Amino acid sequence: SLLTLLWHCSLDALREFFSTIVVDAIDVLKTFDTQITKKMGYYKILDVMYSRLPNELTKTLIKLCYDAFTENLERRRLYHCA
């Protein structure tokens, strides 16, 4: 569902909707299948978010995703890919 709208949503409603849920995603960014699935979705929505254009907290978020890949069952590989 989401990526369909996100790839084609108006670049103004995009800003409003995301700015509504910036911290709502930052906090949740940090059995276990639920966690990895939610983070799947979070990566797959934040990438499309960033695809548009560039507050000041955003600087941190970069690292918060980088380590997410650098860790070294297939859901783990999908997580690294996302």
Place this chain on the structure above:
Amino acid sequence: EQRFNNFLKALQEKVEIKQLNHFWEIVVQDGITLITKEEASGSSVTAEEAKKFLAKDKPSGDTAAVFEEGGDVDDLLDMI
């Protein structure tokens, strides 16, 4: 004389590459008296002038801080 001249060169470059708070600045402002060669004049005086002012300043170079995995973080803090 010349032995302590090359010794002066060595100690000056050694303190230069050393980084201190109360660094050679105190030494230099008191090193206004013969911090450089004096055995044959001409070269002695010009070398003294060159060494008195330690010669320029310009910063460059990426990922050169402590703990490079924070150097990218230092690079990370450049967008706001």
